[PDB]
Amino acid sequence: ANNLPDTQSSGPAHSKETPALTAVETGATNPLVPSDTVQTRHVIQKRTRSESTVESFFARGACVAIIEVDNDAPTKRASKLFSVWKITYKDTVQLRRKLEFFTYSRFDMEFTFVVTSNYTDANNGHALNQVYQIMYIPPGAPIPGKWNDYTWQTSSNPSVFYTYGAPPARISVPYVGIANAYSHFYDGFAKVPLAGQASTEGDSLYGAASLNDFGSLAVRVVNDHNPTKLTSKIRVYMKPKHVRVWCPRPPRAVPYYGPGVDYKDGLAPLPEKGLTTY
Amino acid sequence: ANNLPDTQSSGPAHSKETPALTAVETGATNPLVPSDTVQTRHVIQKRTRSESTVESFFARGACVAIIEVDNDAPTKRASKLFSVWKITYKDTVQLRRKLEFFTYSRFDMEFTFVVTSNYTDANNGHALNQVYQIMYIPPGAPIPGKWNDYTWQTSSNPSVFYTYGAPPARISVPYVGIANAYSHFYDGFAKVPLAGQASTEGDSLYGAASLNDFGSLAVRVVNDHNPTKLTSKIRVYMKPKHVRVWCPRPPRAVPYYGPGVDYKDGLAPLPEKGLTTY
Amino acid sequence: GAQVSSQINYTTINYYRDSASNAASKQSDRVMQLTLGNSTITTQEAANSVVAYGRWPEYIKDSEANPVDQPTEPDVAACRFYTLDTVTWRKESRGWWWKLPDALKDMGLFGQNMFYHYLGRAGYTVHVQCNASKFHQGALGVFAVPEMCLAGDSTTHMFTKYENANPGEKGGEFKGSFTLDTNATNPARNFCPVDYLFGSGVLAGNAFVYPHQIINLRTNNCATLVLPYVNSLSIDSMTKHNNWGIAILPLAPLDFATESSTEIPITLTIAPMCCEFNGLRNITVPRTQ
Amino acid sequence: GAQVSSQINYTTINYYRDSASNAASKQSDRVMQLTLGNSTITTQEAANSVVAYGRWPEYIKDSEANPVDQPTEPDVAACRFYTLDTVTWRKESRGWWWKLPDALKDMGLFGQNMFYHYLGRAGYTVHVQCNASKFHQGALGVFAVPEMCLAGDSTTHMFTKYENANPGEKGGEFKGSFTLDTNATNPARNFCPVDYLFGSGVLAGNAFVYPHQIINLRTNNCATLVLPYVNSLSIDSMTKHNNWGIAILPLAPLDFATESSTEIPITLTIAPMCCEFNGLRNITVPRTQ
Amino acid sequence: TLGNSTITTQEAANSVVAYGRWPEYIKDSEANPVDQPTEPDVAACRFYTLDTVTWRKESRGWWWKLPDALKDMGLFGQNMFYHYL
Amino acid sequence: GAQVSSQINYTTINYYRDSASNAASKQSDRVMQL
Amino acid sequence: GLPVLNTPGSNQYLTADNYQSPCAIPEFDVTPPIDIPGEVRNMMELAEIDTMIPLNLTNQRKNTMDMYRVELNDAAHSDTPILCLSLSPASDPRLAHTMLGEILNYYTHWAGSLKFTFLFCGSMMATGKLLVSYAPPGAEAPKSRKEAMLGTHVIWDIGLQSSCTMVVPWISNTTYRQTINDSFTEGGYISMFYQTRVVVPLSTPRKMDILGFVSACNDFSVRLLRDTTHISQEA
Amino acid sequence: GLPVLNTPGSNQYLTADNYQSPCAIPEFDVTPPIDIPGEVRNMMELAEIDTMIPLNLTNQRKNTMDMYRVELNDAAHSDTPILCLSLSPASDPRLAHTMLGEILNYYTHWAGSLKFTFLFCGSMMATGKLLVSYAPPGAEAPKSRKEAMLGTHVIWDIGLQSSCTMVVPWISNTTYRQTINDSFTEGGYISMFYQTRVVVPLSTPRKMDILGFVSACNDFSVRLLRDTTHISQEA
Amino acid sequence: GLPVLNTPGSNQYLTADNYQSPCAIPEFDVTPPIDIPGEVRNMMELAEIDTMIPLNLTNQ
Ligand SMILES: O=C(O)c1ccc(NS(=O)(=O)c2ccc(N3C(=O)c4ccccc4C3=O)cc2)cc1
Ligand SMILES: O=C(O)c1ccc(NS(=O)(=O)c2ccc(N3C(=O)c4ccccc4C3=O)cc2)cc1
Ligand SMILES: CCCCCCCCCCCCC/C=C/[C@H](O)[C@H](N)CO
Ligand SMILES: CCCCCCCCCCCCC/C=C/[C@H](O)[C@H](N)CO
Structure with missing residues (x-):
């Protein structure tokens, strides 16, 4: 967020110093300023880079998931009375691309849950205000098997009970990585296959570290069902905070295809433009 | 907001100084006080101009837009599930006229959103409380094409989620002009047509600077549709704050006609009044 | 931290990082000689001179310089009095208007510098000259209008074309009434500036809020307006943007004790001042006709 | 307690024990000789050397040591230049890639230590050698990519098998276009790294954000990249995880004034640096073929 | 570097300052005309590139005159033609 | 009154008379005769 | 948390309120101001500028430049008024649409002295003396010079000034x-x-x-800001 | 409790807000950071890195490595341009997808000087002089060296550097x-x-x-963060 | 009263939250503690105690 250097007055030049000429082969960028190649006036620079700090770049809540749940009679096998969403930023694209400008990152994370609901039909009465349970299931904790099984006691899991109509729920977590930074890219495997092991052993997905690195969110409607079916969507908004990032990378240029770096479609991003056309 | 000068006692005058006589040809206003032309008593003046400061003059939220959106089945092609309003103070007249008392202005801006909703029919059930998304789309950011396309992830755009029934939403922005002040009037063009260019090139609207100077607001109902159609209006109230203004102008005298200074109707504002009629 | 302010006090605390989040805090004069470059103006019947907004023209300070390339300052080659084509004040005249820098675009080296550069800045000394006899009567209001936008002639908004909006030294004339251009095949796309609406939908009587002088034929025969550069930017494109407009309106009609219609000339002599140009390249050749 | 900060100030108070609850606070160079262990490299046409991110390789500091067992530091036995198999740059070549430490897994005592230990750490000195004549032309971009993940060849995500992801010293080659592997019975499960997508769906033109050099045949015949250990951990498993990728892309095609297709060799010579190993046990024998 | 123009060269043979005298403005002690002069500076004191000529085996040589050669060169030419001196 | 504690600090104030209302504060050997 | 009690007025939106709100664009690098000429800090500054009075609002003159001109001639002396108007600077049609009147029409209350200037646009060879009068209210409006000269008045000599x-x-x-x-x-x-x-x-x-x-x-001075009747909009 | 009054904006969710929220995992023992190489603190640091321009976006070259190469040859001298582009670093297709352009496409406003570097990849035995020009806007775009040399320009001598x-x-x-x-x-x-x-x-x-x-x-510098058009998602 | 603005998370119930709440039994005369042997202050203290490993989990 630092200010910018002033432009210094620069007059005619006639000398053996040639800042214009360089050698990009060295791998360095020629740090020229306008006064190196043209005559410049004195300008007291007042612009700053306050809004391009990494913190400012990521200081936005981005939607990373839309978790759909129902409030309906359990006999209705079509309805889904609870939903489990594995935590990740890779279900949407925008925040993913912003994060993947970099190879490593540390940040606290602010989760904000925006809950919307609606009737599905109009001939089965009405509903009282719903309460939603959002339980964090860290890896290894038992995953709910039913909307009302014992796991929802949440004696040790953190849970947020959100009352419909209240302002979106919000919680914060610190940096919870087991490494010293989050790895946006992992060039490796969880397993190394060993010679003599059958083809079904030692095989792991390329670039995946843990089968379950950050656990899940289990969402249900706590209320018992009304005579009419209600559908709800919980939109999850992530905001990195206190961000640090390492090893910048070129941003994604073609559409994402899965959680890896794979690509299948849209491999022609650049449009056509004449070489000598302005 | 300064106090006013006291009136000083002034007695009979018989001298060669003639403050009453002047010459308006010079372009200056004769700064006479009552004591210059009549006998006056001493008056300790207590009135002040606190309420005619430019800040006090503009320290009011004015409605600048009424954005109508619907919550209805997407198959109903008549319903409008999202709306994009280009940001401007020229859709209404009152704030526009007040601002156009002056040629240039700098101000922070407070936006307050007053959201109202209603049923459209009575034979399709009821609705749960709606949540509205108001996303600022700065110029160049992708405009939503559908009420539920990717753009609503709002990873970098600022968005306000407003819950129906909550007090009107409110946000603030600083002075965001790319110039050193907002220009209420621009006597020029975005393009200069060049000799030899076809008639279809170099043509731009008179007085317009940018095709999209401040971007838009995209408004939707986040909820999935209920069995009955709901209509909502988001009224946008602007309040300039920390106002500075330059180069006063005569106020608009005839009805506005478009975003320029053009006029078509109501060109006879003055009524009839006898020259010698009090 | 906490600000205690008189109203018996009240306490204000800012809870947000950004200042925009903060709540609103409510707390003889007849004889003159002008010399610029190689040009000189004398007058024996002036009414003093008006410096618009009390601000003399000045060059861009380093604290406000936006472009970084070394500017060009032709000085006397451009900062000199150019005399525009003379117009004829008659009994029926409704008024005249010009735009600056547009009116001077063909004026020697000022015009050359204007068209060779992306960016240009200049104040002006405008000298309106209108002499008559002690037996004539009439009054001209001379107004310098920042950002003098004028109303168009069609139902289409903001439709006046560049060529008509920049007539050059000839300028344009105010009209006595609004005539709508109905030729849809070949629209004129021209201004229709009505005099009593001051050509922009505002009562002409209020135009005196603008920097102005009055040439009252019984009193003076010239008006001098010194205009600083006025814009929302330190420097701008002179071809795209006219910083100033000059409006001349007959406040009192010309009259002279003769049956035949008398006519007297009005001559505008304008000197750019503190000219500054940036962004040199090949010359801009605007489309005309 | 209460923090008063400039924006005219604003007050911030933390109401929660945990810091995560806190709101976001917005406040000649051509001639070189390199010696490592018993190996030496001379060059007369270098373009200086690039130390990736300006960080020289270093051993793990006590303040950052995760494993507690005494590490092994073979030093000269492993921190020495190993020369990989030479590849042939032709007119049609699209580029080559290697992974580190994978490329060095069969390189003497470095490879032995790598496979005998659970944990390994090393920086590198990569020296790309490509000489031609003053009548040749062409340019190679040499990029050191941390966590150089490459795109697969199938509809199944992240499906490249360990054997193909770790080719060893031979490395792999970038392709000119994406070919989808449709053999469902016996999938290749191989990378399909497209050159202009830099093999990972990012435009190759932007790969210069990575530590890099260019071998421009008219200017230099070698590139030297000094890579520190880069990872989200002080030390990691070398068999599971490749810390670095080396990519070589022909930025300008090889050309030589002959009808016959010219070919010149490119040789990679890589020295591990500050090698550190932990967790000794029986040797890991990775599955191959 | 002059004005907005820059020339680089890697195979020069040093530069020759004719008669060892750098160009200079007219000193007050040698000023003949009394009117305030114009000094466009960067608008005119900049590198203009003339039409390229072709050296062949048979070429006998080329000549130009100054300021004549620059008479159509932008603002230098304009100033040249707008002024007596 | 107000307690300022390290986490860069945070402020805690007890609004209730009873302590229960307070938030949780996270701060040879072989031979013997008997 | 801290015990609180919501008072009346909570959750309302008063368009004249002055509260803080969150910034939707944090850390924005605002363009600094420049010293533009003609800064205005109080609307009264605008009201203090002389603006021409549409004194002659007859059927044929209103909504034309002629409405600004009052005709004098050299006829024999008479006591009949040349022009008459009421001191209602905001509502009198001849004053309402001046800059002073336009500013006043945004306020409910006004107080202070006004300043009427008259410019003679005859020939230099024309001479005359006029009387300009102000009669405070409560009596019959002056319909001849005899009544008008009893109030405040200035006798204007038409000369060099x-x-x-x-x-x-x-x-x-x-x-x-x-x-x-x-x-x-x-x-x-x-x-x-x-x-x-x-x-x-x-x-x-x-x-x-x-x-x-x-x-x-x-x-x-003026007070009690309000919306004007001088501008309107239609659906 | 303490009398309070809820103001407008209460209960809203502004995605750019900066408020405190309760920690869902209190007393967590956070893993300390290590000194990873290559830390970045401002996105402008990324924009200051030279990245190759896809200068040649013809039908057969776009979306291939060839789009990065501009062909020169030893033909007789001509004044016709070798390459032409507009200084629209965020929207010009040849600049939009560079690292600079990618960063700019997350922001609404940009200001500052740009830096174009050209690398000659011919043989050492090749020699030549080129002219690289920038014409500030407002005039006809330079279509020959005669017009281009009137703007800002550098004459590049192809040699050892x-x-x-x-x-x-x-x-x-x-x-x-x-x-x-x-x-x-x-x-x-x-x-x-x-x-x-x-x-x-x-x-x-x-x-x-x-x-x-x-x-x-x-x-x-840049300002007014915004979402880019360079990435999209489908249902 | 004092102008306030409710933020996201208001009215939620986070089971891990640490807030104050009113006492339902004010002025209760709490029984003082005694020095019971074997106080534990960290669960790791329990993990540091050797416990027998069911090493032989065969069918029988
Ligand atoms: O309305 C918007 O904000 C919103 C609208 C569209 C959008 N992009 S999308 O490509 O249409 C899209 C649409 C849905 C999902 N999505 C699911 O379908 C889902 C199921 C379960 C868990 C998580 C998710 C999840 O992310 C992801 C992306 C994102 C957000
Ligand atoms: O109720 C009132 O407060 C309100 C009522 C009337 C009113 N004036 S109006 O002349 O009737 C008028 C009526 C509508 C709109 N208007 C639209 O129709 C619209 C559509 C989309 C975006 C913005 C707008 C917008 O301003 C503008 C002016 C203003 C506000
Ligand atoms: C209701 C409480 C829920 C709390 C959830 C805490 C989980 C925090 C997850 C943060 C997400 C970090 C981003 C992911 C990092 C990289 O992808 C991984 N290192 C690789 O998978
Ligand atoms: C939800 C967040 C929305 C934030 C919107 C920020 C935009 C701010 C717009 C302020 C309006 C300024 C008034 C317009 C000025 C002049 O008309 C322009 N200079 C000319 O078009």
Whole structure:
């Protein structure tokens, strides 16, 4: 967020110093300023880079998931009375691309849950205000098997009970990585296959570290069902905070295809433009 | 907001100084006080101009837009599930006229959103409380094409989620002009047509600077549709704050006609009044 | 931290990082000689001179310089009095208007510098000259209008074309009434500036809020307006943007004790001042006709 | 307690024990000789050397040591230049890639230590050698990519098998276009790294954000990249995880004034640096073929 | 570097300052005309590139005159033609 | 009154008379005769 | 948390409120201001500028430049008024649409002295004396110079200085007047008469024009901001 | 409890807000950071890195490595441009997808000087002089060296130093330019021409390539974060 | 009263939250503690105690 250097007055030049000429082969960028190649006036620079700090770049809540749940009679096998969403930023694209400008990152994370609901039909009465349970299931904790099984006691899991109509729920977590930074890219495997092991052993997905690195969110409607079916969507908004990032990378240029770096479609991003056309 | 000068006692005058006589040809206003032309008593003046400061003059939220959106089945092609309003103070007249008392202005801006909703029919059930998304789309950011396309992830755009029934939403922005002040009037063009260019090139609207100077607001109902159609209006109230203004102008005298200074109707504002009629 | 302010006090605390989040805090004069470059103006019947907004023209300070390339300052080659084509004040005249820098675009080296550069800045000394006899009567209001936008002639908004909006030294004339251009095949796309609406939908009587002088034929025969550069930017494109407009309106009609219609000339002599140009390249050749 | 900060100030108070609850606070160079262990490299046409991110390789500091067992530091036995198999740059070549430490897994005592230990750490000195004549032309971009993940060849995500992801010293080659592997019975499960997508769906033109050099045949015949250990951990498993990728892309095609297709060799010579190993046990024998 | 123009060269043979005298403005002690002069500076004191000529085996040589050669060169030419001196 | 504690600090104030209302504060050997 | 009690007015939106709100664009690098000429800090500064009075709102003159011109001639002396208007700067149609009147129409209350200037636009060879009068209200409006000269007045001699200013002093029972037509806060009557007459020699126009201007004195102030009736919008 | 009054904006969720929220995992033992190489603290740091310009977006070259190569040859001298582009670093297709352009497409406003570097990838035996020009906008775009040499320009001598940098100085009426195609904040024209010509001896390739790179100078800044058009998602 | 603005998370119930709440039994005379042997202050203290490993989990 630092200010910018002033432009210094620069007059005619006639000398053996040639800042214009360089050698990009060295791998360095020629740090020229306008006064190196043209005559410049004195300008007291007042612009700053306050809004391009990494913190400012990521200081936005981005939607990373839309978790759909129902409030309906359990006999209705079509309805889904609870939903489990594995935590990740890779279900949407925008925040993913912003994060993947970099190879490593540390940040606290602010989760904000925006809950919307609606009737599905109009001939089965009405509903009282719903309460939603959002339980964090860290890896290894038992995953709910039913909307009302014992796991929802949440004696040790953190849970947020959100009352419909209240302002979106919000919680914060610190940096919870087991490494010293989050790895946006992992060039490796969880397993190394060993010679003599059958083809079904030692095989792991390329670039995946843990089968379950950050656990899940289990969402249900706590209320018992009304005579009419209600559908709800919980939109999850992530905001990195206190961000640090390492090893910048070129941003994604073609559409994402899965959680890896794979690509299948849209491999022609650049449009056509004449070489000598302005 | 300064106090006013006291009136000083002034007695009979018989001298060669003639403050009453002047010459308006010079372009200056004769700064006479009552004591210059009549006998006056001493008056300790207590009135002040606190309420005619430019800040006090503009320290009011004015409605600048009424954005109508619907919550209805997407198959109903008549319903409008999202709306994009280009940001401007020229859709209404009152704030526009007040601002156009002056040629240039700098101000922070407070936006307050007053959201109202209603049923459209009575034979399709009821609705749960709606949540509205108001996303600022700065110029160049992708405009939503559908009420539920990717753009609503709002990873970098600022968005306000407003819950129906909550007090009107409110946000603030600083002075965001790319110039050193907002220009209420621009006597020029975005393009200069060049000799030899076809008639279809170099043509731009008179007085317009940018095709999209401040971007838009995209408004939707986040909820999935209920069995009955709901209509909502988001009224946008602007309040300039920390106002500075330059180069006063005569106020608009005839009805506005478009975003320029053009006029078509109501060109006879003055009524009839006898020259010698009090 | 906490600000205690008189109203018996009240306490204000800012809870947000950004200042925009903060709540609103409510707390003889007849004889003159002008010399610029190689040009000189004398007058024996002036009414003093008006410096618009009390601000003399000045060059861009380093604290406000936006472009970084070394500017060009032709000085006397451009900062000199150019005399525009003379117009004829008659009994029926409704008024005249010009735009600056547009009116001077063909004026020697000022015009050359204007068209060779992306960016240009200049104040002006405008000298309106209108002499008559002690037996004539009439009054001209001379107004310098920042950002003098004028109303168009069609139902289409903001439709006046560049060529008509920049007539050059000839300028344009105010009209006595609004005539709508109905030729849809070949629209004129021209201004229709009505005099009593001051050509922009505002009562002409209020135009005196603008920097102005009055040439009252019984009193003076010239008006001098010194205009600083006025814009929302330190420097701008002179071809795209006219910083100033000059409006001349007959406040009192010309009259002279003769049956035949008398006519007297009005001559505008304008000197750019503190000219500054940036962004040199090949010359801009605007489309005309 | 209460923090008063400039924006005219604003007050911030933390109401929660945990810091995560806190709101976001917005406040000649051509001639070189390199010696490592018993190996030496001379060059007369270098373009200086690039130390990736300006960080020289270093051993793990006590303040950052995760494993507690005494590490092994073979030093000269492993921190020495190993020369990989030479590849042939032709007119049609699209580029080559290697992974580190994978490329060095069969390189003497470095490879032995790598496979005998659970944990390994090393920086590198990569020296790309490509000489031609003053009548040749062409340019190679040499990029050191941390966590150089490459795109697969199938509809199944992240499906490249360990054997193909770790080719060893031979490395792999970038392709000119994406070919989808449709053999469902016996999938290749191989990378399909497209050159202009830099093999990972990012435009190759932007790969210069990575530590890099260019071998421009008219200017230099070698590139030297000094890579520190880069990872989200002080030390990691070398068999599971490749810390670095080396990519070589022909930025300008090889050309030589002959009808016959010219070919010149490119040789990679890589020295591990500050090698550190932990967790000794029986040797890991990775599955191959 | 002059004005907005820059020339680089890697195979020069040093530069020759004719008669060892750098160009200079007219000193007050040698000023003949009394009117305030114009000094466009960067608008005119900049590198203009003339039409390229072709050296062949048979070429006998080329000549130009100054300021004549620059008479159509932008603002230098304009100033040249707008002024007596 | 107000307690300022390290986490860069945070402020805690007890609004209730009873302590229960307070938030949780996270701060040879072989031979013997008997 | 901290015990709180929501009071009346909670959750309302008062368009005149002055509260803090979160910034939707944090850490924005605001463009610094430049010293633009002509900065205005109080709307009264605008009211203090003389602007021409549409004094002559007859059927054929209103909504034309002619409405700004009052015709004098060299006829024999008479006591009949040249022009008459009421001191209702916000509601009198001849004052409402001046800059002063336009500013007043955004406020409910006004107080202070006004300043009427008249510019004689006849020939230099024309001479005359006029009388410009202000009669505070409560009596019959002056319909001849005999009544008008009993009130405040200035006798204007038309000479080298072609303009004359009459200050309408603040004379009011109430500390403020309303910006509407209302008898309780009526302001009085302004009139102009021939003192001697206009005299011209031969070969000179016998009819000339005077122009009227009005502005506010330095003691002038307004209060109770309000919406004007001078601008309207249609669906 | 304490009397409070809820103001407008209460209960809203502004995605750009900066408020405190309760920690869902209290007393967590956070893993301390290590000194990873290559930390980045400002996105402008990324924009200041030279990245190759896809200068040649013809039908057969776009979306291939060839789009990065501009072909020069040793033909006779001509004044016709070698390459032409507009100074629209965020919207010009040749600049939009560079690292600079990618960063700009997350922001609405940009200002500062740009830096174009060109690398000659011919043989050592090839010689030549080129002219790289920037014409600030408002005139006809340079279509020959005669017009281009009137603007800012650098004459590049191809020799031992095979790269040349031209700084496009910040020359703008507005203090910032928009990151979209918009005539009001247009940036100007960048062009390349043969100064003399490329000359090669016998037994040398007569056609070679130059590569273009662009980066931001130290005076460069951006503002008004926004979502890019460069990434999209489908249901 | 004092102007306030409710933020996201208001009215939620986070089971891990640490807030104050009113005492339902004010002025209760709490029984003082005694020095019971074997106080534990960290669960790791329990993990540091050797416990027997069911090493032989065969069918029988
Ligand atoms: O309305 C918007 O904000 C919103 C609208 C569209 C959008 N992009 S999308 O491509 O249409 C899209 C649409 C849905 C999902 N999505 C699911 O379908 C889902 C199921 C379960 C868990 C998580 C998710 C999840 O992310 C992801 C992306 C994102 C957000
Ligand atoms: O109720 C009132 O407060 C309100 C009522 C009337 C009113 N004036 S109006 O002339 O009737 C008028 C009526 C509608 C709109 N208007 C639209 O129709 C619209 C559509 C989309 C975006 C913005 C707008 C917008 O301003 C503008 C003016 C303003 C506000
Ligand atoms: C209701 C409480 C829920 C709390 C959830 C805490 C989980 C925090 C997850 C943060 C997400 C970090 C981003 C992911 C990092 C990289 O992808 C991984 N290192 C690789 O998978
Ligand atoms: C939800 C967040 C929305 C934030 C919207 C920020 C935009 C701010 C717009 C302020 C309006 C300024 C008034 C317009 C000025 C002049 O008309 C322009 N200079 C000319 O078009």
